[PDB]
Design a protein around this ligand. Structure first.
Ligand SMILES: O=[N+]([O-])c1cc(N2[C@@H]3CC[C@H]2COC3)ccc1NCCCCCCN1C[C@H](O)[C@@H](O)[C@H](O)[C@H]1CO
Length: 762
């Protein structure tokens, strides 16, 4: 019942973060829309200037959400240098009826100071509908060659019932052609082309548009329009009007100078149809609500209480929550469980490559996923351990939203307990991913950081849009039922980890409190360990079936501590007893297998040339894991030595945050130098939260933790703020020597954790 209200609230959104601006509902095969625009200055330039899928290069100053809440809508701003255009896309949801409500958008384009004042810009609104028993029709024009006013599309489906979608006339100069062609094509007006293609290719908006433009050009060629006397470019690239029935509708406008137009989606089962007056008003309302929620949910503490930090927090937050996508389709999975994937022998990476080279992978599904993403331009899709970080701030904002996303993720889990770490769903998603990197492998794990979110919900539980956001904490019954239904999958994931990611104690000269607790990440190559999330952090060389990884064991610890709390809430006492013994064994086994007294930190372990357990110690993030994951007692002498490592400028401590790897480590700044020195916000965030924990409890390290917490919070926030101020972007990682953001931009993305770091009061 709370489920039905949530379903209905979240159904519609701009859930296509892979494109600048578009809408889809959370339904695999339904109605989608996308925006395209580009300046036209010549006969050949439109194909190069036209924008649709997100990218980041010299031609685009920046883009992002100024404001967003997926229940209500928001405002995105796009700063396009190539096309001399500052664009604004406002989207708003209007609840009502039985079909997930109505929505509207305003597209406003303003030429920048550099653009020719008489620039011609082509704007397209592309609309598609998949589904066997559904209809969509453009109501024809009264006029001869196109539309003087609004374009109305009428459609129906099982999912949406009856609806109307209107593209309004809009404001702005419409250029007029004196050419001969105008007698056949009109002087210049809004046009509509209504087409049909087999459902599975409808997503290919750009090629479909261009095929129509080319047919347009070929008609000119056949009909004696030539270089003797050519029509203007904008008229050459203006489609001949042919509205009708189909599963594809192209709405094209040309504008000279500034422009704007509305898109009004009117769910028939609701009240009166949506108007532009409705849009303007609900835009203003949504802004007020966003304003008030922000100040309550993300109340930035000293020294970030100022307005500059507020605007920064709003940008980082809105971009993260604005990344929410709905994805649908088949994924590519190797279901061969080839025995080479067991990696039980020396040299196992060569065996595994030989297996992969059998190419037994097949598409399977379809699946759906509702998730936030790291990067609109470079990787707009679900990543398993990233989502754990993304949901930390989102959960604060709207716990029901976060729980929905968690549910969405767990619904992917297969019978054995595997969720693919990278969710590439459907041909549209695949288009952005080289074939060689699509295949998922059922023995590949990723950190279970979604348990971190679950933990915070549990603590919240112990201690209509306003209502709906917090319904899962405000009605303990609802909360518990949610945990009840998820609990088995959580448990299945726990079991899967210990089955598939088991390390080898019993087979070597290995003494420890427990014969059981030992873990090794499957999937390592000579240079990489992708499944751990820390691609190129240095690990034992060469890789070896005897390896043990202290990060993985610490994640199993995070998991088991969570199972304790959740089981304890559902009174699964047979389960809670078992967990209690596993936790106890990991605490002991962390020390017995992973602690280096001589180095003063945790290390991964291998097996020698001589068949004996060797620690292989590389000072950095990995070394801190038991502390980052909240496993050490606040009086632990090991914790204190870890605090020395963290605070030590010659090892990890840079002015800009903690270095992934110590400056003393032989691998510092080597090779791709991905996780071999740069400052990464996700691990810094875990550190900051654990420092705070120790700083707010009686113990011997209280005052040290307090100082490190104060400084690290400051350093991390200021580095990310400084870069945002100067570049407009959140970055993937930060240079510890210069403080510059580097690798990819638009990383929102766990970089956005900074809103919560500024927020404090963990
Ligand atoms: O998508 N690609 O497959 C892909 C595409 C391309 N492109 C080609 C064509 C378009 C596109 C842009 O330019 C040329 C280039 C390289 C790759 N490589 C796959 C790697 C995926 C990124 C992992 C980022 N993070 C790494 C963190 O280490 C990990 O912790 C984190 O979880 C993960 C997620 O945030």
């Amino acid at each position: 019942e709370i489920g039905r209200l949530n379903n209905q609230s979240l159904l519609w959104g701009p859930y296509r973060p892979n494109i600048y601006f578009g809408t889809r509902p959370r339904i695999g095969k339904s109605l989608m829309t996308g925006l395209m625009w580009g300046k036209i200055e010549s006969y050949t330039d439109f194909q190069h200037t036209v924008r649709y899928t997100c990218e980041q290069n010299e031609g685009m100053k920046g883009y992002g959400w100024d404001e967003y809440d997926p229940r209500r809508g928001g405002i995105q701003s796009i700063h396009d240098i190539q096309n001399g255009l500052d664009i604004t896309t406002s989207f708003v949801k209007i609840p009502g009826g039985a079909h997930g409500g109505s929505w509207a958008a305003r597209i406003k384009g303003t030429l920048n100071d550099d653009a020719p004042k008489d620039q011609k810009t082509i704007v397209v609104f592309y609309v598609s509908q998949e589904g066997e028993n559904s209809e969509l029709e453009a109501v024809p024009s009264e006029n001869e060659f196109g539309y003087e006013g609004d374009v109305i599309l009428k459609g129906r489906s099982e999912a949406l019932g009856n609806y109307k979608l209107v593209v309004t006339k809009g404001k702005g100069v419409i250029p007029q052609s004196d050419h001969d062609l105008s007698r056949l094509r009109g002087p210049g007006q809004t046009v509509v082309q209504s087409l049909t293609y087999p459902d599975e290719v409808l997503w290919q908006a750009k090629p479909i548009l261009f095929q129509q433009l080319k047919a347009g050009i070929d008609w000119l060629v056949e009909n004696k329009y030539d270089v003797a006397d050519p029509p203007p470019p904008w008229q050459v690239y203006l489609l001949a009007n042919k509205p009708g029935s189909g599963n594809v509708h192209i709405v094209q406008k040309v504008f000279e100078g500034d422009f704007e137009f509305d898109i009004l989606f009117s769910s028939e089962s609701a009240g009166k149809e949506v108007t532009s007056k409705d849009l303007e008003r609900e835009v203003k309302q949504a802004t007020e609500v966003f304003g008030e929620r922000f100040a309550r949910v993300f109340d930035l503490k000293a020294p970030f209480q100022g307005d500059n930090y507020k605007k920064f927090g709003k940008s980082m937050f809105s971009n993260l929550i604005g990344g929410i996508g709905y994805f649908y389709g088949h994924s590519l999975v190797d279901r061969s469980y080839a025995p080479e994937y067991d990696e039980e022998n020396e040299g196992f990476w060569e065996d595994a490559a030989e297996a992969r080279a059998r190419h037994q992978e097949a598409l399977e599904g379809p699946y759906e996923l509702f998730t936030s993403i790291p990067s609109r331009p470079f990787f707009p899709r679900g990543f398993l351990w990233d989502e754990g970080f993304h949901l930390l701030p989102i959960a604060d904002w709207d716990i029901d939203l976060a729980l929905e996303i968690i549910k969405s993720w767990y619904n992917l889990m297969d019978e054995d307990g595997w969720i693919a770490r990278e969710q590439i769903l459907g041909a549209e998603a695949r288009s952005k991913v080289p074939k060689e990197f699509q295949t998922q492998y059922p023995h590949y794990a990723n950190p279970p950081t979604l348990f971190l979110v679950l933990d915070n919900f549990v603590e919240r539980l112990r201690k209509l849009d306003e209502t709906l956001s917090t319904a899962s904490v405000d009605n303990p019954e609802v909360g518990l039922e949610y945990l009840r239904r998820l609990y088995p999958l959580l448990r299945r994931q726990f079991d899967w980890f210990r089955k598939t990611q088991a390390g080898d104690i019993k087979s070597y000269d290995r003494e420890a409190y427990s014969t059981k607790e030992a873990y090794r990440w499957r999937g390592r190559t000579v240079s990489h360990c992708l499944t751990s999330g820390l691609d190129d952090y240095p690990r034992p060389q060469p890789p070896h079936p005897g390896e043990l990884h202290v990060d993985l064991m610490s994640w199993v610890g995070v998991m088991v501590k969570s199972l304790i709390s959740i089981g304890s809430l559902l009174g699964a006492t047979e389960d809670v007893e078992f967990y209690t013994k596993v936790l106890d064994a990991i605490e002991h086994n962390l020390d017995d297998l992973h602690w280096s007294e001589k180095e003063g930190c945790y290390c991964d372990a291998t097996i020698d040339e001589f068949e004996e357990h060797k620690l292989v110690c590389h000072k950095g993030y990995i070394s801190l894991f038991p502390f980052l994951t909240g496993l050490l007692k606040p009086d632990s002498p090991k914790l204190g030595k870890l605090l020395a490592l963290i605070g030590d400028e010659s090892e990890l401590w840079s002015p800009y945050g903690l270095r992934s790897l110590s400056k003393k480590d032989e691998f510092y700044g080597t090779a791709e130098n991905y996780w071999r020195s740069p400052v990464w916000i996700n691990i810094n965030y875990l550190a900051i939260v654990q420092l705070y924990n120790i700083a707010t409890q009686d113990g011997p390290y209280k005052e040290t933790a307090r100082d490190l917490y104060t400084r690290l919070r400051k350093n991390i926030v200021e580095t990310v703020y400084r870069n945002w101020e100067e570049t407009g972007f959140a970055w993937e990682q930060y240079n510890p020597e210069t403080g510059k953001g580097q690798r990819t931009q638009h990383f929102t993305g766990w970089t956005s954790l900074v809103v919560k770091i500024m927020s404090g009061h963990h």
